[PDB]
Amino acid sequence: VSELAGHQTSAESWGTGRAVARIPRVRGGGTHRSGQGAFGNMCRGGRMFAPTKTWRRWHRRVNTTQKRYAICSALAASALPALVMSKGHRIEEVPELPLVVEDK
Amino acid sequence: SSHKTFRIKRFLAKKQKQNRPIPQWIWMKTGNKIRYNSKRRHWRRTKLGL
């Protein structure tokens, strides 16, 4: 979410008295958005709580030996008969489950 | 002001021609989204700025 979302509006709080809920409201004007409430996550429009940043830790690195262990386990379970059907593959008519074909 | 200038009179002349409503054939088109003229300025309600 953009950093300017909610902060483009200038809104000073009305203070106390006025019997309003002590919220930064839009500074005057003969329109619908005048004394309405701009800042805060709970107001209509404005900003939300915790704007998602571009510098979130999106990427996770794995050790090379763990990557190779995952490859070896994913290849070794592709030879067992029950684990392939438990993935869901219809393999009833396949003549051999380590299906090795020619170089053509 | 009866003592007008040419620039102010031309500025009022454009608004007097903008004050007219829409025709009746404009809402017979395909992609119409205009029911009426929403920019109708009345001489008591909106005082044209200045």
């Binding site: 005057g28 003969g30 329109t31 004394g35 | -």
Partner: peptide, 24 residues
């Protein structure tokens, strides 16, 4: 007619108003 502005503030109950005062 445009949106009417909010009912204005009027110093109604300050030190200046003798119609109501608290214990001083």
């Amino acid at each position: 007619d445009p949106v009417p502005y909010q009912p204005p503030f009027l110093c109604q109950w300050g030190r200046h108003q003798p119609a109501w005062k608290p214990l001083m």
